[PDB]
Ligand binder design. Sequence first.
Ligand code: HEM
Ligand SMILES: CCCCC[C@H](O)/C=C/C=C\CCCCCCCC(=O)O
Ligand SMILES: CCCCCCCC
Ligand SMILES: CCCCCCCC
Length: 465
Amino acid sequence: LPIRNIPGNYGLPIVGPIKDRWDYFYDQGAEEFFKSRIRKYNSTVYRVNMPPGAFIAENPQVVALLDGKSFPVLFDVDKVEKKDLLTGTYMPSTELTGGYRILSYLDPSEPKHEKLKNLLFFLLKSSRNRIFPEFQATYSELFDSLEKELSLKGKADFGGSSDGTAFNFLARAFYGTNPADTKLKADAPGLITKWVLFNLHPLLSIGLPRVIEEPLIHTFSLPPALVKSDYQRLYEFFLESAGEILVEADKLGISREEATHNLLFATCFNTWGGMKILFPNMVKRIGRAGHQVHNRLAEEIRSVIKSNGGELTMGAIEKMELTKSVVYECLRFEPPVTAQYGRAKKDLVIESHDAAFKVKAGEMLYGYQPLATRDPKIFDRADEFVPERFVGEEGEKLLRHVLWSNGPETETPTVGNKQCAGKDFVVLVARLFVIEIFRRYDSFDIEVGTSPLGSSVNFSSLRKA
Ligand code: HEM
Ligand SMILES: CCCCC[C@H](O)/C=C/C=C\CCCCCCCC(=O)O
Ligand SMILES: CCCCCCCC
Ligand SMILES: CCCCCCCC
């Protein structure tokens, strides 16, 4: 491949980044922000300013990787450093996380990365016999409530009940604890939402006019002091509920305090937060796929469970080919977290489809994942949601290009890499979610709107089996 100069520029100090931030949030939106510049520069690799800049991030300058050939450099821990860049070119105050740099911010070169990731692997393994029954019980209650709401209002808001369901499910599955039996009662979603806002506001729009939003959430950090008492309520819940997991933390040589803040983060930010994005997005894409797809899913799911004596098991799920494929297609089409960063550790040569680009040690690399996973030089019908895309031997090969977990779907998270520690769990619960929908319903209709995280979704019909 020819070596090309990396196109793009950062504009003037102060005003360049501000204009780019306006495009990103208001005048273009993320997808068109990136696509318009791919067109202008005739390149899927280019220099661009990323939010937040202002007084939140020291340096907004990145090299963007916007195709599925260049993007995977972001996974290579021998090429990129992954320290303090979970959220990009700024890091939320450690005052938001008990004074600790939490696992997700740690480079694999840091010894506590191995210890803490092992702790989460244990959490997940130890929960294995609780996941199915607790998912089925909590999500059954959710669909009961949605049917109730639909009967009253003619529509049922998914997100504002499903957030409670997700936390209750996680508390019961991971910790054998029903939040209703604790001081948290039903408050957890509100507490976590506020705390997440204090962490991620520089990256989000909350729908307000830019004249309000820009000074309020895009210029300076919200003060961590204002969420400390809410966080303490969460901390005490984890400290008191996570006894069994804290025993393993002790054996791994992690302090009780550090383990607790890490369990809180993994459960509330990584898991509950990721589910908050993923589940409504899944309802949106599956809804749009139409009733014929719904009927095919219902037929497969119900037939398979019947073949399994009515027992839903991991092996039964492996028979649900369309279901597995639909879940992967949600993850490919609409990666729940679009932004992955990595700082070049050394000088690199980054290959794209038609050229290679040289980057210097210290440059911040950034990838907008949807452009890698909807790359038409990798996927046919790239901008179409194709339920059956991953069905069969040939379809399954394409899983190497599904990147939602910050690594190929064909690869395994390890203590040596920065791939999502919960990769198998996410894919499992996403499958269980589809299964619970279509064991109950033949088909459904939805109404859709915007949300600061993910999508706002109402059900307008739920056709019972
Ligand atoms: C739908 C839910 C989830 C989504 C969308 C998601 C997504 C991601 C992504 C994109 C990353 C890469 C972050 C980066 O460096 O840029 C990540 C990392 C991580 N996730 Fe997940 N995740 C989810 C659930 C979970 C669960 C269930 C766990 C429980 C262990 C978890 C724990 C972690 C941890 C600890 C990291 C950092 C890994 C490391 O430091 O090596 N996440 N996740
Ligand atoms: C509340 C955060 C939910 C996602 C948790 C998941 O485990 C990984 C997070 C990774 C990076 C932190 C920034 C998350 C920003 C998500 C919304 C904007 C986007 O998609 O880039
Ligand atoms: C009015 C509150 C806005 C909701 C913020 C949610 C961000 C996680
Ligand atoms: C949009 C940010 C509002 C800040 C909330 C502070 C109230 C404790």
